[PDB]
Amino acid sequence: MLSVASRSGPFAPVLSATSRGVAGALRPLVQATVPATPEQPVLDLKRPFLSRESLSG
């Protein structure tokens, strides 16, 4: 029950040659957007987000 899924906490990176590392556990996200200004860092050699594992036609 040590898994980040079973117990939300620190991210566990999925960083790899074939895929982006996005995953993890909260660590607050998205909820900050209702409150003003969650501006997010811009273009420090930034990758595109999301990572399209959720492809659609």
Binding site: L2, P28, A32, P35, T37
Partner: peptide, 15 residues
């Protein structure tokens, strides 16, 4: 205070 914030509990779990 003002609305712009975000607050929540955190729980690391290691052996």
């Amino acid at each position: 205070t003002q609305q712009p914030f975000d607050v929540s509990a955190f729980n690391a779990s290691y052996s």
